[PDB]
Structure formats: structure tokens, C-alpha cells
Structure 1
Amino acid sequence: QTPDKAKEQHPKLETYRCTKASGCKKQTNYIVADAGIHGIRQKNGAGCGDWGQKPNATACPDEASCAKNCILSGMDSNAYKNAGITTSGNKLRLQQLINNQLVSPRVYLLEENKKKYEMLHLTGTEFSFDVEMEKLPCGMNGALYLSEMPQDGGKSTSRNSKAGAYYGAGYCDAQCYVTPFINGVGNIKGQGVCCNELDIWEANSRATHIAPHPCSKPGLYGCTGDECGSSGICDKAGCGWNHNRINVTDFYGRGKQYKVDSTRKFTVTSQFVANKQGDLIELHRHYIQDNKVIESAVVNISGPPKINFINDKYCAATGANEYMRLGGTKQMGDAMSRGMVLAMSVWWSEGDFMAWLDQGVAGPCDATEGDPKNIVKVQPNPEVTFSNIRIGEIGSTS
């Protein structure tokens, strides 16, 4: 689409870069809402297409027409606030609903210049954030992850691409979903928009999940046919790590009966260990609550190695077949070494209620409380605050 001339007032967010020798140095970054949230419409107010489909065929018979006919409106602070996005110092607050409307924001981290995404190279490094999960019940998903999105939002791929990173263009992930816009241009062919993805944090106050999702194609790839499916180019399922699934049900949850208490602030530290060749080999996780390091628990089911971290042996032993098939941990680390975009979001699912995250073996939720209709009964304003993002040498961010 083509941005209008309305001012874009991206919320500011302080973040830190750290080393064992110098500590953590504060940096200014900006938050940008996804392109879709800005509002992309034709001149008669109609939209340019819905999630899961190609762009409206009348406004977008081709790319140039699509770019001319679909306008993206800039977002002032108010627009951000009404989209459920606000920031304060080093904190980012994401609200699922504002004035009774479903806003469910998805935002990306921008470099201080606002023209490009801050590309994070995590292989061999450490990443820490503080999170407030009390207001996220069964069925909710407060996510902090990385996607190998184009740094300029896809601008360089075409003369018709104008939104750029400045307006949140270029989203992609390992589900290869068909979105109306791809790389800032009309997705005339209806391709699935794929890319390597690292889910560092997918949670609610009842269950937490970690999951690297490798893809055999670097950067953003427009898949066609079977390239988009289960046996295609991206690992949809991922190699997951959820304490409940490896039978350690008292590790995380609401209250005093859990090692990490989801009703109170805590720190999440992730360490991406590389071997001598600089390849990713292991994903480690530990938490900090009440000034105490809480280490992850070792697998408590038979099958997988007795370790408290992700690795190819573990992944293969837990049935992540696509993960292994697409290159496993090393393939994931290559995408991380090339550089990826930090995405943060809040959402729910009318379709499966996030059962894969917090029901049966994944957690303590029944089969219906996670329904969005029930979610609002348990908690009228689901929300999540991610803050104090620190990236740097292993051993120096928390």
C-alpha cells in the first residue's frame, strides 16, 4: 500500500546492549505496529483484503494498481494507544482490547532512526526480558519472538513497495500464511508468506512455551502449493519446550505452588549456545524471580535426554520431525546469525483456544475456559507488559 501523510508517532522504548566487562548500556529503540493495524483502505473506505487471502481483486489487479488504490494511514500516539500499544521507559504494554474493541496488537522493534528494523543476531548470545503475565488467563497468548523479516520491510524488492519498516511492512513467520500484502506489495499470487522464526516466549499465566521453527529458505519466501504445507519449507510445529509436556507441572503457574509464579513479575533469560564452528547447538533458559535464579527443570518423561534445554537430540526424541527434516538447530541458528526482527504480540484463538499451549499435557486449562467469550469473563482486559529487554554476552544480561 501507500502511506498517507499523517504523522507516525512510534512509541519510544529504552533497550540495553550488555557485556560482562562494561555492563548494560541503554539504547533508544522505537516500536512500530504491524502494517495492517495502521489501517489499509481504498478511497471508498472498503478494505484491501483479509488475512488468509489475496488482496481485493478490484483495487489490486496488479501491484502498481494495488499500491495506488490501497492507502495505509499513519498512526499518531493516540492511534497507538487505541491500538492497545503504549510504552514507558523500558516497558511495552500490549492490551488485547481497548474501549470494548478487539485490538490484539503485533509490534516490531525499530532502530533509533525508525527506517529499519533493529536486526538481532542471537546465535552465541544471550537475551533477557522482564514480563508481567498475571492478566493472561487460559487461551491467551502474550508473545515475544523473532522472525526473519526484511530489514527495510521489503521496500527494496519492488518499485511498488513503499511502507517499509517505518510502517510495519514485511511480516512473515513459519506458518506461511497467505496475507493480502507481502513485502509491502499486493500479494497478487496468493503466496504463503514464510520465514524462519524463533519463539522465545509464547505464554499465558497458566503455561509457557519455547519454540525454534526452522525453514529451508533464507529470509522471506513467498511459497506456492505444497511449499506452504506440513511437508513444505517451514516447520509449522516447531521444536517445543513446555515444562508441562516434559512432566514438570509445578515449574510455572499462578501462585506459590510453582517455582516461577506467573502472578508476579519475573525475568526470562535465554542463552543461544554455539559450537566451535559458530553454529547454534543448544537453547538454554533460566528465570529470575525474587532475586533468585530458577533453572529450567530436566526432562521428566522417558524418551528425551535428561537435560533442561533444547538440542537436536531432544527435538528428534520429542517428535519434531519437520524441525529435524528442515535442518534443525543449525538451520535455526543460521537465520539467527543472518539477523532477525523482534516481534511482540497479544492474541487469542477463536479456533483452537490456544489448547496446544495450556490444555491436556500442555497445561491446566479445561477445554472451554480459553474460549474468548469465557476469557473476558475471567479477565475483562487481558494484557501483558514486556520490559527491560537486554541483549548481549552470555552471562551479562541478568
Structure 2
Amino acid sequence: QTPDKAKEQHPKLETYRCTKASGCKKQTNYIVADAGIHGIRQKNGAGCGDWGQKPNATACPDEASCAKNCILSGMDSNAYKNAGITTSGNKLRLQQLINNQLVSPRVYLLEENKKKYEMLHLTGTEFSFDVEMEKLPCGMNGALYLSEMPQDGGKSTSRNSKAGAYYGAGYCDAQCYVTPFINGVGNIKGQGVCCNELDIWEANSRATHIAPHPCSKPGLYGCTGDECGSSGICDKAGCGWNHNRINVTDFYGRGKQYKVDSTRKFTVTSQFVANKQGDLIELHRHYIQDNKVIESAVVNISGPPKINFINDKYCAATGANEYMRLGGTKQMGDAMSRGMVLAMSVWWSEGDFMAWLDQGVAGPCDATEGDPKNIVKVQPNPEVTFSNIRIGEIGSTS
């Protein structure tokens, strides 16, 4: 789509780069709403296509026509605020609803110039954030994750690609979903938009999940047919780690009866460990609440190695077949070494209610309190605040 002339006022976010020897240093970074949330319309006010579908056929018979007919509205400060996005110092607040409107924001981190996404190379490094999870009941998902999206939003791929990173273009992930735009251009062939993805944090106040999703093609890839499927080029499932699935159900939850108390603020430190050859071999996690290092808990079911981190032995043992088949931890770390885009969102699901995250062996929720219609009864205004993001040498962020 072709950006209109309206001013874009990206919310400011302070983030930190750290070293054992110098500590953490402040950086100016910007937050950008997905291209979609900006508003992509035809002049007659019609839209240019729906998630899961290719673009308007009349507006986008071809790429150039699509580029001309679909206009993207710039988002100013109030636009950002009505989309549920706000920042303060080093805090980012994402609200799920604004004035009874489902806004469910997805935002990406920009470099200080606003023209490129801040690309993060996490293999061999450490990543930490603080999160405020209390206002997230069952069924909700406050996600902090990375996707191997084009740094420029796709702009260099075509003459017609105009939105760029500056307006939130070029999203992808390991689901390979068919979206109306690929790389900032009409997705005329209706391909799935794929790419390696690292889910550092997917949670609500009742359950958390960690999950690397490797893909066999580098960067953003428009899959076709089977390339998009279960045995396709991406690991749709991922190799997850939920303390409730490895039988340690008192590790994370609301209240004093849990090691990490989801009703209060806490720090989430993740450590991506590399071998001598520079390949990712293991993913470590530890928390900080009340000035206390809360170590992750060992596997408490028979099968997996008795460890408290992700590695290929664990993933293999836990039935992460596609993960292992598409290259496992080394493949994921190669995307992490090339550089990935930080994505942050708030969402819920009318289709399965996030059951994979907080029901059965995943958590303490029943089969209906996660329903979006029930979620607003429990918590009328679901939200999440991620803050104090600091990337740096292992041992210096938390």
C-alpha cells in the first residue's frame, strides 16, 4: 500500500545495551504499529482484503494497481493511543480494548532513525524485560517475541513496495498465514508469509510459554501449497516450555502460592547459549521478583532430560518433531544470528481460547473462562505492560 501524507507520530521507547564491564546504557528506540492497524483503504472507503485472504481483486488485479489503489493512513499520537499503544520512559503499554473497541495491538521496535527495524542478534547473548501481567486472565496472550522480518519492511524487494519499516510493513511468522500484503506489496499469489520465529514470552497471569520456531528458509518466504503446511518449511508448533506441562504447577501463577507471582511485577531474563562454533545450543530462563533470582524448575515428568532449559535433547524427548526436522536449535540460532525484529502484542482467540497456553496440562483454566465473552467479565479491560528491555552480554542485563 502507499502511505498517505499524514504525520506518523511513533511513540518513543527507551531500551538498554549492556556489558559486564560498563553496565546498561540507554538507547532511543521507537515503537511502530503493524501496517494493518494504520488503516489500509481504497478511496471509496472499502478495504483492501482480509487476514487469511489475498487482496481486493478489483483494487489489486496486479501489484502496481494494488500499490496505487490501497492507501495507508499515517498514525499520529491519538491514533496510537486509540489503537491501544502508549509508551512512557522505558515502558510500553498495550491495551486490548479501547472504548469497547477490540484494538489488539501488534507493534515492532524501530531503530532511532525510524527507517529500519532495530535488528537483534540474540545467539550468545542475554535478553531481559520487566512485565506487568496482572490484568491478563485466562484466554489472553501478552506476547513478547521475534520474527525474521525484512529490516526495511520489504521496501527493496519491489518498485511498488512503499510502506517500509516506518509504517509497520513486512510482518511474517512461523504460522505461514496468507495475508493480503507480503513485503509491503499486494499478495496477489496468495502465499503464506513465513519466517523463523522466537517466542520468548507468550502468557497470561495463569500460564507462561517459551518457544523457538525454526524454519528451513532464511528471511521472509512466500510459501506455496505444502510449503505452508505442518510438514512444510516452518515448525508451526515450536519446541515449547511451560512449567505446567513439565509438571511443576506451582512455579508461575496468581498469588503467594507460586514461585513467580503473576499479580506483581517481575523480571524475565532469557539466555541464548552458544557452543564454541557460535551455534545456539541451549535456551535458559530465570526470573527476578523481590530482588530474588527465581531459577527455572527442572523437568518433573519422565522422558525429557532432567534440566531447566531448552536444548535439542529436550525438544526431541518432548515430541517437537518439526522443530528437530527443520534443524532444531542450531537452525533457530542461525536466524537469531542474522538478526530478528522485536514484536510485542496483546490478543485473545475466539477459536480455541488460548487453550494451548492455559488449560489441561498447560494450566489451570477451564474450557470456557478463556472465551473472549467471559474474559471481559473477569477483566473488563485486559492489558499488559512490557518495560525496561535490556539486551547485552550474558550476566549483565538483570
Q: 1:333-361 CA deviation, whole Å, 9 max, x = no partner?
A: 00000000000000000000000000000
Q: 1:218-269 CA deviation, whole Å, 9 max, x = no partner?
A: 0000000000000000000000000000000000000000000000000000
Post-superposition shift, 1:44?
Answer: 0.2
TM-score calculated relative to the size of structure 2: 1.00
Post-superposition shift, 1:188?
Answer: 0.1
Post-superposition shift, 1:137?
Answer: 0.2
Rounded to whole Å, the distance in 1 between the matches of 2:62 and 2:327 is: 36
Rounded to whole Å, the distance in 1 between the matches of 2:77 and 2:202 is: 27
User: Helix, strand or coil for the counterpart of 1:136?
Assistant: coil
Return structure 1 stretches of 4+ with deviation > 3 angstroms.
none
Post-superposition shift, 1:212?
Answer: 0.2
Post-superposition shift, 1:66?
Answer: 0.2
Identity %: 100
Rounded to whole Å, the distance in 2 between the matches of 1:144 and 1:165 is: 18
Q: 1:7-51 CA deviation, whole Å, 9 max, x = no partner?
A: 000000000000000000000000000000000000000000000
Rounded to whole Å, the distance in 2 between the matches of 1:3 and 1:258 is: 48
> Which residue does 2:64 correspond to in 1?
64
Post-superposition shift, 1:209?
Answer: 0.1
Post-superposition shift, 1:110?
Answer: 0.1
Rounded to whole Å, the distance in 1 between the matches of 2:267 and 2:158 is: 41
> Which residue does 1:112 correspond to in 2?
112
Rounded to whole Å, the distance in 2 between the matches of 1:235 and 1:49 is: 26
Post-superposition shift, 1:132?
Answer: 0.2
Rounded to whole Å, the distance in 2 between the matches of 1:9 and 1:283 is: 36
Structure 2 segments unaligned to the other structure (5+ residues)? none
Post-superposition shift, 1:112?
Answer: 0.1
Post-superposition shift, 1:299?
Answer: 0.1
> Which residue does 2:43 correspond to in 1?
43
Post-superposition shift, 1:98?
Answer: 0.3
Rounded to whole Å, the distance in 1 between the matches of 2:334 and 2:366 is: 38
Post-superposition shift, 1:104?
Answer: 0.1
> Which residue does 1:34 correspond to in 2?
34
Structure 1 segments unaligned to the other structure (5+ residues)? none
Post-superposition shift, 1:301?
Answer: 0.3
Post-superposition shift, 1:165?
Answer: 0.1
Q: 1:202-224 CA deviation, whole Å, 9 max, x = no partner?
A: 00000000000000000000000
Rounded to whole Å, the distance in 2 between the matches of 1:282 and 1:123 is: 10
User: Helix, strand or coil for the counterpart of 1:362?
Assistant: coil
Post-superposition shift, 1:82?
Answer: 0.0
Q: 1:109-152 CA deviation, whole Å, 9 max, x = no partner?
A: 00000000000000000000000000000000000000000000
Rounded to whole Å, the distance in 2 between the matches of 1:375 and 1:182 is: 32
Rounded to whole Å, the distance in 2 between the matches of 1:320 and 1:69 is: 43
User: Helix, strand or coil for the counterpart of 1:203?
Assistant: strand
Rounded to whole Å, the distance in 1 between the matches of 2:209 and 2:102 is: 24
User: Helix, strand or coil for the counterpart of 1:376?
Assistant: helix
Post-superposition shift, 1:100?
Answer: 0.6
User: Helix, strand or coil for the counterpart of 1:163?
Assistant: coil
Post-superposition shift, 1:313?
Answer: 0.1
**RMSD over aligned Cα, in angstroms?**
0.2
> Which residue does 1:247 correspond to in 2?
247
Post-superposition shift, 1:102?
Answer: 0.1
User: Helix, strand or coil for the counterpart of 1:336?
Assistant: helix
Rounded to whole Å, the distance in 2 between the matches of 1:67 and 1:387 is: 36
User: Helix, strand or coil for the counterpart of 1:361?
Assistant: coil
Q: 1:33-80 CA deviation, whole Å, 9 max, x = no partner?
A: 000000000000000000000001000000000000000000000000
Rounded to whole Å, the distance in 1 between the matches of 2:159 and 2:254 is: 51
User: Helix, strand or coil for the counterpart of 2:163?
Assistant: coil
Q: 1:289-340 CA deviation, whole Å, 9 max, x = no partner?
A: 0000000000000000000000000000000000000000000000000000
Rounded to whole Å, the distance in 2 between the matches of 1:324 and 1:122 is: 20
Rounded to whole Å, the distance in 2 between the matches of 1:201 and 1:67 is: 35
User: Helix, strand or coil for the counterpart of 1:360?
Assistant: coil
User: Helix, strand or coil for the counterpart of 1:178?
Assistant: coil
Rounded to whole Å, the distance in 2 between the matches of 1:190 and 1:95 is: 31
Post-superposition shift, 1:89?
Answer: 0.1
User: Helix, strand or coil for the counterpart of 1:335?
Assistant: helix
Post-superposition shift, 1:200?
Answer: 0.1
Rounded to whole Å, the distance in 1 between the matches of 2:129 and 2:186 is: 35
> Which residue does 1:290 correspond to in 2?
290
> Which residue does 2:25 correspond to in 1?
25
TM-score calculated relative to the size of structure 1: 1.00
Rounded to whole Å, the distance in 1 between the matches of 2:295 and 2:43 is: 55
Rounded to whole Å, the distance in 2 between the matches of 1:2 and 1:264 is: 43
Post-superposition shift, 1:280?
Answer: 0.1
Rounded to whole Å, the distance in 2 between the matches of 1:94 and 1:217 is: 31
Q: 1:71-111 CA deviation, whole Å, 9 max, x = no partner?
A: 00000000000000000000000000001100000000000
Rounded to whole Å, the distance in 2 between the matches of 1:88 and 1:270 is: 24
Task: Tell whether 2:201 aligns with 1:201.
Answer: yes
